[PDB]
Amino acid sequence: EYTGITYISGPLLFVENAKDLAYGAIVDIKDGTGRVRGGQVIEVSEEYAVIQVFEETTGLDLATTSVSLVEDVARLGVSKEMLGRRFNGIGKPIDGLPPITPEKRLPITGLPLNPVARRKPEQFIQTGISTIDVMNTLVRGQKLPIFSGSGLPANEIAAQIARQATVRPDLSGEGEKEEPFAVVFAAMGITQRELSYFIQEFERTGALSRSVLFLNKADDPTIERILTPRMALTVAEYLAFEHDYHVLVILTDMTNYCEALREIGAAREEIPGRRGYPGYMYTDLATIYERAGVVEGKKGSVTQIPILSMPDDDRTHPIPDLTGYITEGQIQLSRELHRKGIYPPIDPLPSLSRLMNNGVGKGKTREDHKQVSDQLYSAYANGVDIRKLVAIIGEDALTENDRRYLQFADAFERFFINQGQQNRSIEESLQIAWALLSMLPQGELKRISKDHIGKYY
Amino acid sequence: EYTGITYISGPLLFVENAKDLAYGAIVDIKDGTGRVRGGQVIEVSEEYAVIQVFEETTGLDLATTSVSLVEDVARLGVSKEMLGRRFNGIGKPIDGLPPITPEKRLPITGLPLNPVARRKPEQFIQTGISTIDVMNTLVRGQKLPIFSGSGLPANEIAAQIARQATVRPDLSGEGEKEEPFAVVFAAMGITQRELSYFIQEFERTGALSRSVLFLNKADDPTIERILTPRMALTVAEYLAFEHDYHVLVILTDMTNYCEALREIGAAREEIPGRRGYPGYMYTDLATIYERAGVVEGKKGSVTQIPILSMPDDDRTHPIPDLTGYITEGQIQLSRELHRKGIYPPIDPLPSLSRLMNNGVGKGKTREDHKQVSDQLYSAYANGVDIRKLVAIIGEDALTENDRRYLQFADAFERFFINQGQQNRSIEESLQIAWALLSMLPQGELKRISKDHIGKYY
Amino acid sequence: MIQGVIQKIAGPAVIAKGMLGARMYDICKVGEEGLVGEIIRLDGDTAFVQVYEDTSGLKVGEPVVSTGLPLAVELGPGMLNGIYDGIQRPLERIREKTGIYITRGVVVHALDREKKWAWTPMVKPGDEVRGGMVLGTVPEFGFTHKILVPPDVRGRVKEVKPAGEYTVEEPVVVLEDGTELKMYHTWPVRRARPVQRKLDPNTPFLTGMRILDVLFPVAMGGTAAIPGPFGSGKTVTQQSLAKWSNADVVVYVGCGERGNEMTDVLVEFPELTDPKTGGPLMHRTVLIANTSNMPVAAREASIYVGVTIAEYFRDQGFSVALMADSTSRWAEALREISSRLEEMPAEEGYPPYLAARLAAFYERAGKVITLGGEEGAVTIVGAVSPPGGDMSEPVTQSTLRIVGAFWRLDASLAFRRHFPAINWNGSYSLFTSALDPWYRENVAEDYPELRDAISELLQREAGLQEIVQLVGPDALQDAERLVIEVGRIIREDFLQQNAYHEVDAYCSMKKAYGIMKMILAFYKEAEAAIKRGVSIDEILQLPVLERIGRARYVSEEEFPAYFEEAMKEIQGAFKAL
């Protein structure tokens, strides 16, 4: 215990000596204005240990202060009735109804994952927005960032896929007792618009019977934004591996993560500027995207599905750049088709799907799933390509081996990309994909050969 | 004494026993050279202070460190005999009249204009020019910056308009006895030629027995740079509000003002700003400009015209940004124009004055003025589109309308924009506009009504 | 309570010891001059003090008398129709004690306490109060204002005066259980009143400008922005907004505003006329605006003030209409203060704590249901005023996601005298999605159906004008003509308006709704005209077009009868040909 303080400050402050303060310990501080705070004890000194201030500088005095150790490190309960319930907020969750009993109290720091305790994917996620899960092949063995960008909404898209993920015994690879209707959402910081949007979405999706959504509530202090990710996570790591279930962490915008994070880096005098946003970013993120693999010797996983927007419709900013590097490849949506009406607009022109033939096969999804993967990609690609070089030399440059690739981009357009919010099975997608692969002469195709031609028309 | 001398590197000084000293003070320093020097006392403490010597730093010794207290309070005369003198710098004998006349020992900053004691523009001034008084009315207490370039002489195009400017509120029903022509000028960091070329204009024809100069040479210390304005600032208050006179403050070269400032702040522990120029600029720059705007019941008020330099009028450093929030409008300079010797060079669409019809009305600057002012904007701007294109559109397509719009331009820059150093009034500067438009048909006149045409053509 | 002595004077910031066991935020008298200051972050037995005003001859070691109690915002009668500043002091009592130009060491109160304000009670002796709903009201001539006692202040009330005019300082009530109050109540500056549920806007948007609210609904409790520099045609929106718009109260606020342009507004403020109040707008308008002819820390203190006071009104079931002008410029101050500290700029030339207080500003403002169960709305219009229009400045690329709507006006669109001048390809409102339920529910059934549909006009007209109808529309297809035939009605009816004529600028749901409606029913008949080969000479000369035009020159009175005749006229003028 330590009475007296010698620095009143907003992000970090002086606590004389130390002899039992752990790293990342929970302390309780009565401010003497009748208020109480906590924090982590990250950095411990026999000179001045500095403690994580959990709220603004106002409402502090030296008339009455005490620092008192509550626990060694951070810890919190994980109920087995956590699934099928929304637990908004953190510490004491205010989801506006009573909190669920902390049945197993374990650490919420993170539990690491051995790199030799991993195994190659074998699960597919059948989600109702065809276009992605066909070409990009949404599997749990990839963690591709979905980039919304400016004037493209991050919410609508995330909102969509919520109820629209479904489970089959073997059109999804694994079983439907190996995949529940449960999912987990972890906020990297929600904002005004982001919250005022998901209000209606809870009562419609079923955040009382199939979804867990930890939030920051958009109005809790900054340091909360570096707490909820990894807290949200660890919870799910338990019921996933040890209890056996597949859950997907559907993240939200990492912009507000940087936001909060940065203020610590200029009040400790670290490297908080890589190109205007932290140079220390990735170090803390090691843990988030470490469990986003596939376990070996247990069944069920955890996969981070980053969903993050960009401060500009150019990537000169560290926001999407440092994320690219960290993680693997990209999936995007852009605004090419959004200006015209298409919804959901999906442009995977500069995309990279790392895996697309692993975690699916033939008979794990469908036969022609493995073949029609790369096909659509370059068929469509070379559609948009024409419209480039026509206009360069007068207003035409097209051939008869162009008129077919041309219309393969119309055929892919409003027929396939546009769909409303209407659930589509992997069957309904690939089946009819082959009648749109009847706009170019079949038999000898770029990636397909005669082995699915005469079977799927 | 006043010893405790540490870091005397360049015109810095620390001294202990600054418990007798104040912020905002100025003191005599003694030494054995026989030089008696000032310099303001900043960043003070019971021990260490920061003094920045009036002239150089060569003479400071360890023997004599004593300080004869001049005055902790800031002393500044309010003058009333300064309405027809000449001074360079702080206030030194050029014409052999004494620096200032005491009434009070008012501080340098007493704090700017109270906003509820400020009224709307309702009068105008006339600077003897056409385009910047017809097309864009320079009103009452207007703050209008003149963004000039580099490699161009700012200074000459300034004082050029000195003698031309004699006000004309004739048309409203007020004299130039209730609107006197008072030029109060404060530059800094001006060249040896230019500093003599200024006084030349004045002494030419009678206008130096109704105006005061102040102009701190580029060889007068960077400490004196700053205070130069503040002096005549505080005197000015007492000129135009309390004598009912009307002053026109014309500053020149802001780059020097801002360079010198930086050195001062960098020792008070204030970090410099974007593209090295200080960020504590804002406050200090405000205080000079905000003694502009009319005042309730007091007819006389100061009109502000600051002039500053930029490499090509680019907005990629603080000097324009800052300025451009408190001040209204911008009036940039054209390379084409100044080459051809069309003075003053004012651009087409790039130039605009934010207020131009709320200080003038109909019959106060003439009634037809209203729609004439928005003719010559759209009418000039059209010739600038073929002021070089007459052989880039070949002789294989050439039309009557646009051809006539080349001839419009040549006569518009010759006669309208430039008018030599010959004086003009509202009524003579209006004549020019009509005459030139007379070549043009009624069908190319569209921004002026038939009513106004039925007055003058 | 406390007394200290100055240690350092680093420009406008001060460092002073002798202040230990202090309470954060104080009225504070720096020296004997009496420069207004605030005790902030202490360290050891000394502290950092941010002193709003300048110095000019303050000695080191002088006496510093300070309150030793937290400064809170004071709220009571005289808030409505009183001139104030962002420091929570009345601007008029300053003018009266400083004359033409501000003087140092002049401090004033925090409320209009020298005036004897009307009173009538709403509680009676020996009854308990409920916080966050009522206490008793002030009937002000200008606008009604319910002075209520904040939440969690329970316990019996004793001696409640009846009707009469009573000064702020004099009691009109007292509490039986102690902690007797007068008419002035104190709330901590950055503490926000808690809520019973989050809510979502569903109150229809009308600002008195066609395209402005009818295409882009953002509703009450939305958060907007108007980019580019303020002035040069942008003033149109700001002024007209509070005149027409459905809000009960208006709050105006500056933080680095212009010179002459910041005064044109104040002076023309009472001559702007509200129809509910039927005279002076200034009656239901609260002023707390700050310009750079006010102290250093003026602009840095600005936000929180205004934010709080808005929540007061919210609580009484009154919608407020806040205008957080010059957001960009707010930070000027913050930066200056933070230089002199360890909290140095580290982002992109501005604080990284910029990010926190910009965000939070919007997260405290919306439609919600307070603890007393009354609902208000705390709509913000975001004049940012960046120097280029750039996104690589902090202020913009942060707001951009946080606040979901951007309302760009173009200079060209403005200059022809057809208002609003809103450039559509450069405006957006991500709000519209979630409001489409609540729009059709309360307003009109086919209301959404009109907006989304009709917008296609501008889209096929934008790329049509360019250089494709260079050769006249008569040398183009009859399907590409059709676009300018409808084009007339959209540009002379549904986008033309005057801020000079008050019989057309007063608009509401029912008027705007029929206008957009007719242009659907005229496209349905235009396109049936070209399918029958009806000439484009006689359709452009129909009485039908004129019948729209006369119904934008009446506010909403003659509108119902003109819709009876006008609708059916379309019907029998394509059937008369």
Q: Concatenated DSSP letters for B71-114?
A: ESSPP-B--SS-SS--EETTTEESSSS-S---S-B--S----B-
Q: Tell me the three state secondary structure of residue A307.
A: strand
Q: Which two tokens stand for residue C305?
A: 């003030």
Write down the residue that tokens 């501000």 correspond to.
Answer: C102
B 306-325 near C (Cβ less than 8 A): 315, 320-321, 324-325
Contact between C310 and C273 under an 8 Å Cβ cutoff? The reply is no
Burial label, A140 (beta-carbon count in 10 A; 0-12, 13-18, 19+): buried
Contact between A329 and A144 under an 8 Å Cβ cutoff? The reply is yes
In C, which residues are within 8 Å of B282 by CB distance?
Answer: 292, 332-333, 336
Interface test with C, best of B14, B118, B284, B322 (most C CBs within 10 A): B118
Q: Tell me the three state secondary structure of residue C108.
A: coil
- Which chain A residue has its CA at the smallest distance from C425's CA? A339
Contact between A289 and A143 under an 8 Å Cβ cutoff? The reply is yes
Q: Which chains touch B (3 or more CB pairs under 8 A)?
A: C
Distance spanning both ends of chain B, measured CA to CA? 80
Shortest distance, CA C567 to any CA of chain B (angstroms): 35
- Kind of pairing, strands B67-71 and C58-59? unpaired
Long-range contacts formed by A276-285: CB under 8 A, 24+ apart: A276/A317, A276/A318, A276/C347, A276/C348, A277/A317, A277/A318, A277/A319, A277/A322, A278/A318, A281/A318, A281/A322, A282/A322, A282/A326, A284/A226, A285/A326
Dihedral sign for Cα atoms in the order B196, B202, B204, B208: negative
Q: How many CB atoms lie within 10 A of CB A53?
A: 21
The set of residues, in sequence order, having a beta carbon less than 8 Å from that of A286 and lying 6+ positions away, is none
Same domain, yes or no, for C301 and C275?
yes
Distance between CA atoms of A192 and A239, rounded to whole angstroms?
32
Q: Which of B45, B293, B325 sits opposite C60 (nearest CB)?
A: B45
Q: Is CATH 3.40.50.12240 the classification given to domain A1-457?
A: yes
Order of strands across the sheet that contains C195-197: C195-197, C367-370, C375-379, C320-321
In the listed set C380, C413, C429, which residue is the last one of a domain according to the structure? C429
Q: Which of A79, A84, A50, A55 is nearest to A67 (CA)?
A: A50
Contact A266 C346 (CB under 8 A): yes
SS (H, E, C) C171-195: CCCEECCCCCCCCCEEEECCCCCCE
Contact B111 C53 (CB under 8 A): yes
Provide φ and ψ at A257, rounded to 5°: -70, -60
Distance between CA atoms of C39 and C202, rounded to whole angstroms?
43
In B, which residues are within 8 Å of C55 by CB distance?
Answer: 22-24
> Following DSSP, what letter does each residue of C258-298 receive, concatenated?
-STHHHHHHHHSTTSB-TTT-SBGGGGEEE---BTTS-TTH
Contact between C345 and C351 under an 8 Å Cβ cutoff? The reply is yes
Contact B110 C100 (CB under 8 A): no
Q: Which of C188, C150, C149, C146 is nearest to C305 (CA)?
A: C188
Distance between CA atoms of C386 and B321, rounded to whole angstroms?
9
Contact A191 C21 (CB under 8 A): no
C 55-84 near B (Cβ less than 8 A): 55-61, 83
The set of residues, in sequence order, having a beta carbon less than 8 Å from that of B381 and lying 6+ positions away, is B348, B349
Q: Which of B75, B99, B67 is nearest to B85 (CA)?
A: B99
Q: What length does chain B have?
A: 457
Q: Which two tokens stand for residue C536?
A: 């484009």
Geometric angle at alpha carbon A455, from A452 and A456, rounded to 5°? 80
Distance spanning both ends of chain A, measured CA to CA? 76
Torsion of CA A229, A231, A237, A239, to 10 degrees: -130
Contact C9 B44 (CB under 8 A): yes
Chains B+A touching (3+ CB pairs under 8 Å): no
B 352-371 near C (Cβ less than 8 A): 352, 354-355, 358
Torsion of CA C328, C333, C337, C340, to 10 degrees: 80
Dihedral sign for Cα atoms in the order B105, B108, B110, B112: positive
Q: Which of A289, A328, A246 is nearest to A110 (CA)?
A: A289
C232 in reach of chain B (CB within 8 A): yes
> Following DSSP, what letter does each residue of B146-209 receive, concatenated?
EEE-SSS-HHHHHHHHHHH-----GGGT--SSSS--EEEEEEEEE-TTHHHHHHHHHHHSS-SS
The separation between CA C491 and the C-alpha centre of its own chain, rounded to angstroms, equals 29
Provide φ and ψ at B204, rounded to 5°: -45, -80
Shortest distance, CA B43 to any CA of chain C (angstroms): 5
- Sequence letter at residue A102: P
Q: Which of A331, A335, A434, A423 is nearest to A376 (CA)?
A: A434
Distance spanning both ends of chain C, measured CA to CA? 90
> In which element (H, E) is residue C525 found?
helix C523-530
Distance between CA atoms of C417 and C492, rounded to whole angstroms?
11
Q: How many CB atoms lie within 10 A of CB C277?
A: 15
Q: How many CB atoms lie within 10 A of CB C75?
A: 23
Q: Where in the sequence is the domain holding C319, given as residue range(s)?
A: 72-114+182-429
Q: Tell me the three state secondary structure of residue C169.
A: coil
- Which chain C residue has its CA at the smallest distance from A219's CA? C363
Asked if residue B344 has a cis previous peptide bond (ω within 30° of 0), the answer is yes
Q: Which of C42, C362, C428 sits opposite A151 (nearest CB)?
A: C428
Contact between C11 and B268 under an 8 Å Cβ cutoff? The reply is yes
Distance between CA atoms of C511 and C518, rounded to whole angstroms?
11
Q: Tell me the three state secondary structure of residue A30.
A: strand
* Cross-strand pairs, B25: B41
The set of residues, in sequence order, having a beta carbon less than 8 Å from that of B298 and lying 6+ positions away, is B241, B242, B244, C100
Distance between CA atoms of B286 and C256, rounded to whole angstroms?
10
Distance between CA atoms of C427 and B342, rounded to whole angstroms?
41
- Kind of pairing, strands A331-332 and A146-147? parallel
C 6-25 near A (Cβ less than 8 A): 20-25
Geometric angle at alpha carbon C458, from C456 and C461, rounded to 5°? 105
Distance between CA atoms of A424 and A134, rounded to whole angstroms?
11
Q: Which of B72, B283, B289 sits opposite C57 (nearest CB)?
A: B72
- Which chain A residue has its CA at the smallest distance from C391's CA? A312
Provide φ and ψ at A67, rounded to 5°: -120, 130
Shortest distance, CA B205 to any CA of chain C (angstroms): 34
The set of residues, in sequence order, having a beta carbon less than 8 Å from that of B399 and lying 6+ positions away, is none
Contact B295 C100 (CB under 8 A): yes
Q: What length does chain C have?
A: 577
Helices (H) and strands (E) counted in chain B, each on its own, are 14, 15
Q: Which of C264, C344, C387 sits opposite B358 (nearest CB)?
A: C264
C346: CATH: 3.40.50.300
Provide φ and ψ at B243, rounded to 5°: -110, -10
Distance between CA atoms of C325 and C322, rounded to whole angstroms?
9
Same domain, yes or no, for C521 and C551?
yes
Distances (CA, A) of A412 to A201, A383, B13, C271, C283: 30, 10, 76, 59, 60
B 27-56 near C (Cβ less than 8 A): 42-46
Q: Which chains touch C (3 or more CB pairs under 8 A)?
A: A, B
Distance between CA atoms of A417 and A344, rounded to whole angstroms?
7
C363 in reach of chain A (CB within 8 A): yes
3-state helix, strand and coil shares in percent for chain C, rounded to the nearest 5: 30, 20, 50
Q: Which of C59, C100, C264 sits opposite B72 (nearest CB)?
A: C59
Write down the residue that tokens 């304005």 correspond to.
Answer: B229
B107 in reach of chain C (CB within 8 A): yes
Distances (CA, A) of A39 to A24, A73, B103, C347: 8, 10, 61, 25
Q: Which one-letter DSSP state was computed for residue B363?
A: T
Question: Buried (b) or exposed (e) across A228-267, using 16+ Cβ within 10 A?
Answer: bbbbbbbbbbbbbbeeebbbbbbbbbbbbbbbbbbbbbbb
Q: Which of A117, A318, A338, A345 is nearest to A237 (CA)?
A: A117
Distance between CA atoms of A246 and A112, rounded to whole angstroms?
18
E-strand stretches of B227-385: 247-252, 303-305, 307-309
Contact between A188 and A159 under an 8 Å Cβ cutoff? The reply is no
Write down the residue that tokens 């982002």 correspond to.
Answer: C347
> In which element (H, E) is residue A78 found?
strand A75-78
Same domain, yes or no, for C103 and C220?
yes
Write down the residue that tokens 């600032």 correspond to.
Answer: B233
Q: Which two tokens stand for residue B307?
A: 């002039």
Q: How many CB atoms lie within 10 A of CB A20?
A: 9
* Cross-strand pairs, B304: B143, B249
Q: Which of C259, C261, C296 sits opposite B290 (nearest CB)?
A: C259
Q: Within 13 A of C117's CA, how many CA atoms are on the CB side?
A: 34
Q: Which of C192, C197, C353 sits opposite A263 (nearest CB)?
A: C353
In C, which residues are within 8 Å of A276 by CB distance?
Answer: 347-348
Number of domains in chain C: 4
B290 in reach of chain C (CB within 8 A): yes
Contact B119 C10 (CB under 8 A): no
Q: Which two tokens stand for residue B41?
A: 């006392």
Write down the residue that tokens 């904002």 correspond to.
Answer: A191
Interface test with C, best of B47, B113, B241 (most C CBs within 10 A): B113
What residue spans define the domains of chain A? Answer: 1-457
> Following DSSP, what letter does each residue of C209-261 receive, concatenated?
-HHHHHHS---TT-B--B-S-SSSSTHHHHHHHHHHSS-S-EEEB-SSB-STH
